[PDB]
Symmetry: C3
Subunit: 477 residues, 3 copies
């Protein structure tokens, strides 16, 4: 029922802050999310990272869900502020934190599960923000990250051969420094509050992450990958955009300009060794922090091994007439979830911003492969069903998976896209960041008062979908 | 209360197909049972090995029942078609299959349990059947098996000291190729179906299994045992038969003839290095494939270290007036569960064919030891209760376990038979092969809808029956 | 909220006989408690060590409670009778017993938990009692113990870096050989039984453990610690006594005399290399077996690393006018739980003897450090609630744990006491020895008919107490 390779590594994915809790235990220090969640009035729906799912204490209860679900790999992330218990370079290390992750990795290997490890998933140590402004201080933050990354390669790299440096850098840059909807919540276009400057600060945070990645890849490529033999990558998200008015030249152009303002921003330095896309250099200043010949030096001393790709939904884009403000980051675009002819991007989950678009996903894989184009692992793909533990039946979610795998099969076998693997978001119901515990994305239902976890129908079926796509000269004998 | 040695290994048994499920995942391919179960009209009572107990995904839950029950050891089977994912010799190995078993072995050793691995338990690769006749082709299959065995000695044999090559070769032969009731379902004397020839095929498959065993013990003796230090053995079954008319010449003779067509067939080559019991070379042709001088060369260039014995019940055998057909495999006999003086063999379980005969179990052990006579491990023994999860109270099973441990004790200290261990069938409730899920043999009730396991009374009491049979200079305080 | 160090190793404790069960299994020979529990009429309120918690079979279920509770360390006890299946020195060594604890140690490690091992916890092999009186025989018993300690060092010493020789030597001596309330139940003053002499026996049984400890620590210091790098200690209990009538010189003296008959007895040889506290040598005879020069040879040829302290309650001692009998072991004292001015020591748990007295706990800590004064680990501390599974709400126990941790903070940062760790009695509800299963001391309620464990609130909360007292430069962000 539509052929995925054979190798094809699939599993489940979970960010650190969204499930671990144990915020002050283990000698961990605060993240910028530990401050954002406790603001008065709350910017996080009155939601907290304390407790969460209590994974820190119940990790082996969850890992046995990973063998029950038949998962092959498990993507998770490290809490920077739990390892270097906040700062970097010269700051002391938290041995208890290193030891906590070292026994998770051991826990996993014992079970036959492939650890995929993400170094940074938005949970920047607070101290570094106060000390020099966090991702706003490009020179400093990338040096502090480089040591952190390297520590992790040292302490976990003999096991763990599958690395991801930074998760969705565009959200950390834009939601964190332009709109302020994510930690640290800085902006000129909100309420608000104390500080921000959405005209210059997102483009700093981007370059800082871009260089942070480059540094760690250079470290890994030169000093580790030979002896340790592993992959390293970055994972970018980005909706596919096709034109609003299909019959209009200016919007076939406006839909691609958006996808260069989202993916091209990062994928040009990190994969093509070119600097910023020109559509993007021409709108923003000056305001766009130049890549110096020293930057391409760190970039050209290391390979990024794969394109990690977070996908959930697509959209229609269409132009502007007017001359855009400084405070525009999308690249002169009005985004819609409907086109000219009233028809939607298609079938919804709700939320509302996420809707199931299985053949714009396929289109997405074909564009993102060739420009750029390294192998694509799908590092996040998931969904919330529309609508208690009536949640055990999630037929919407099952059909979301199936149709989105069908266009991975299609992309591979009809468009010659190399896709190597797929992590489903998420293993547990999380804290959906500043959305709170509202949204339930996981294939396991977490009962936030009992901290009890019971499987949804999707968890027990997903192994059977993968099993029925790999074969294949046995669909006989 | 009735001394079993001190050493005396005991624990539970399970068979690969009967519990694992995950029939298509982990790159495993079809065994011949996968085809037999899916016949239309079903020859397996509408039953499936798809799922079963889902032990592929719940194995570690099951193993904590092993320590909950005080089990010292655990016999289980590999799925040939999961390891060499269909065929042998020149065929690719399934690494996901080999590592799945790697982590079982590992999980057991961690719990202090002693893995006892059966290599073959009726789940011959399907491709092998299609490619040359499966067990019907003696020259090929034994070579395909030798490589298979050798892969296992390499991959699991530094752990794993205790090996059983083939489980109940008599059933595979006769029920698989003479009566057609077990997979692959070929016979002349059934409906039916397409193929079979009960005149000639069970004797081929017999020798093919005998030689497959010899081959593997050859490999193990010459190439692994010296370094790995361990046992290889075969586990044969066979009811004990005594005359139907005690008072009378031709039954003292008829019963033992039936016990040669059943144990001696296999035991003569594998233990005595003699060929086929002559009472058998004399009834079958010609139809009985001769052990070539090249076969006694494989047989006596390696030693089988123990007699693995399955036992469930006993019977009264007795003769033919008339000259027996070509389609007679029991050895010119018709068998009863009754002597003529009316009395039953003794106390039934139902089923209906299996009744608890502890007296004749003892006579059996003494017969089977000295002719042939190596140490006996009882590698399967168990029953189903007469009669929901009312099943938790299983007094019948307990008294069954008790009275047969009694006769083991009796056989050791009075008859001087060496009996080194006892595996109870079964740990879980299974697919009882072509009988389906109906007959519950386990000491754990499995709930086939939830896949829930809860122990039965017998599970928690058996550990105590052994502890009280092994002391012994402290029964003093 | 009141600073405990940073290191500060905290966890839960349990004794061997109290939770293990499986009294005949694993070839384990009887302890002295095995006989005392089965006496007619019962001296243990009709209670039994068989089954108990059945932790022998359910150890992994409880260790999972360990990480759920966020424990750092776990103090447990070996069963001498189970390792050397009864006796010492020349007796065989039960392998099935050594491998059992090797897999607890293995399992604890695998979870990140630090094993703390108590060699002896009141469960002396019965064979030794009958062979030469056990503890009454100083010469033989200290020799059989040195072999035992040694073998443990050998078989578990490369894992396991923290050893406790004997748990509460005072109780084994006085309740065992003076009043008879504990096994083996000898005394001149009781119900009854056939033998005893409280005049002389408790002081023999004291010396015999002192030298057993001395022996073990001799071995460990000289042969193991340099390579194995670890700690060895003894854990001593004893109430804190302050004067009954404040205003009175006669028994600011008698309180301290009672603490020397209770702690100084053991602490003087074991930590100061003095012999018996003067006041004690001068009341007892004759009857107090002198420390030969050869004993102070063992003693100062190896050092005890730390002071294990068992604390539960406190008390008002004070005087005797009268000349003391030959059967007074307390030190010429009448002990009350209230002073002259009516007021109680403070707040009851019940039981009735155990009251929550945090104020004097601090004074205790201050006294025991400086004479003697090595770092102190509270190797036991806990209580039962005043009062079914309404026990899950244990707000008295939480208030007990909190106040007594406050004293530890206070003692450290103001009285200059080194306290390095705290173990809470107990992880589970136990067999509280001769009291039976009545008193529920655990932070996990154990249903003795289901052997089901469910956490009380204290368990889930304790980990947050410690998190909150360790920090400490981020108490800010």
């Amino acid at each position: 029922s539509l052929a995925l390779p054979n190798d094809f590594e699939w599993g489940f994915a979970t960010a650190a802050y969204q499930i671990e809790g144990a915020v002050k235990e283990g000698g961990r220090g605060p993240s910028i999310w530990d401050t954002y969640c406790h603001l008065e009035p709350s910017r996080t729906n009155g939601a907290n990272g304390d407790v969460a799912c209590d994974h820190y204490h119940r990790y082996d209860e969850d890992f046995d869900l990973l063998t029950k679900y038949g998962a092959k790999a498990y993507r998770f992330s490290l809490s920077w502020s739990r390892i270097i218990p906040l700062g970097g370079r010269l700051d002391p290390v938290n041995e208890e934190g290193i030891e906590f992750y070292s026994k998770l990795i051991d826990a996993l290997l014992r079970r036959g599960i492939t650890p995929w490890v993400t170094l940074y998933h938005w949970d920047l140590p607070q101290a570094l923000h106060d000390r020099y402004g966090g991702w706003l201080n490009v020179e400093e933050v990338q040096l502090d990250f480089e040591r952190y990354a390297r520590l992790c390669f040292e302490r976990f790299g003999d096991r763990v051969q599958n690395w991801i440096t930074i998760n969705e850098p565009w959200i950390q840059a834009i939601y964190g420094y332009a709109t302020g909807s994510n930690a640290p919540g800085r902006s000129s276009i909100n309420k608000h509050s104390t500080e921000g400057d959405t005209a210059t600060e997102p483009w700093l945070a981007g370059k800082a992450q871009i260089m942070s990645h480059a540094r760690a890849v250079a470290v890994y490529s030169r000093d580790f990958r030979p002896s340790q033999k592993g992959q390293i990558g970055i994972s970018l998200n980005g909706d596919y955009y096709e034109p609003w008015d299909s019959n209009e030249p200016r919007d076939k152009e406006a839909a691609e300009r958006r996808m260069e303002f989202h993916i091209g921003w990062f994928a040009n330095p990190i994969f093509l060794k070119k600097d910023y896309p020109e559509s993007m250099k021409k709108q923003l200043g000056e305001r766009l922090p130049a890549l110096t010949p020293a930057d391409f030096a760190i970039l050209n001393a290391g390979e990024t091994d794969f394109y990690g790709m977070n996908y959930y939904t697509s959209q229609y884009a269409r132009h502007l007439d007017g001359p855009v403000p400084e405070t525009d980051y999308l690249g002169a675009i009005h985004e819609h979830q409907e086109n000219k002819d009233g028809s939607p991007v298609g079938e919804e989950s709700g939320l509302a911003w996420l809707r199931s678009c299985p053949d714009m996903f396929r289109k997405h894989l074909a564009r993102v492969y060739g420009l750029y184009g390294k192998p694509i692992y799908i590092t996040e793909n998931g969904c919330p069903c529309p609508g208690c533990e009536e949640a055990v039946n999630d037929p919407f979610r099952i059909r979301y998976f199936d149709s989105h795998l069908d266009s991975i099969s299609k992309a591979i076998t009809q468009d010659g896209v190399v896709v190597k693997g797929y992590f489903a978001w998420a293993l547990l119901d999380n804290l959906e960041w500043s959305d709170g515990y509202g949204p339930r994305f996981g294939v396991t239902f977490t009962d936030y008062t009992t901290l009890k976890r019971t499987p949804k129908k999707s968890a027990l079926v997903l192994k059977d979908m993968f099993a029925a796509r790999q074969i294949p000269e046995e669909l006989a004998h």
